[PDB]
Symmetry: none
Subunit: 103 residues, 3 copies
């Protein structure tokens, strides 16, 4: 159909990811699974495929397990993330995207 | 610089660069199996008489291709420039997308 | 012996100073959209078991990050399929394109 592909989005040293698309607003925080420290260098993008709004992780941060173009979170369906890989976690009322450190 | 809308590849993966009078056809396939891919998004942009085909996004599970010029039609003396993802075989044009490492 | 090649950093012209033996080749690191030369992109060519490959150790500032990304196979004269979407041949020269990356916060 008519999919609006947003520009590529990379996370800074704070690891934050503010997604204000449409009538939905949410902030993530890319962190390491073991250390919970913020991560920088994760590429994200949003496409408006039909009516569903999905968040992809085009690239994982450097030194971490590669996450290549995988759907991570469905923005249109609320908290119903795609759940193909449950890397999204809630803690202390905050949302975090998880990347596993490579060996 | 004109206005063109994004298009999504289907089960056939057929792409037609029918702009003005210069027309080219492509088939989005896999880089290993040459199987027709679905999910890629492409858009057309014309700038100074150069019609360029960009890949806005690659299908899920494949290597990310983000706003990369794949094929460019030159209406002047320059020849048509293409990215390395364009392969010619059996008199056809193939747009390849590499699958994920895992 | 394994020949170790020194890495190059692209300047304001965006050109790559690749000069392996007689296989000397010219690449130009440019923006994927504005087609303007980019600086700061760190490349290096290495060899392992008779396979000359061109790696990108770092992408230019403000663009999609890249760490140890294979780009071009110098031995075969063929770009890797995973990076084939970024290798473009225009007027006899080869160009390496990069897409600008926006902030997340």
């Amino acid at each position: 159909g008519e999919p609006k592909v947003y520009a590529p989005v990379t996370t800074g040293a704070d690891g934050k990811l503010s997604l204000s698309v449409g009538g939905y607003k949410k902030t993530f925080t890319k962190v390491d699974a073991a250390t919970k420290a913020p991560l920088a260098g994760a590429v994200f993008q949003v496409v408006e495929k039909d009516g569903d709004i999905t968040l992809y992780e085009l690239s994982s941060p450097a030194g971490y397990v590669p996450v290549t173009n995988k759907p991570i979170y469905n923005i249109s369906t609320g908290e119903a993330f795609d759940s193909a890989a449950a890397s999204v976690v809630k803690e202390d009322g905050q949302y975090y995207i998880t990347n596993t450190a490579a060996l």
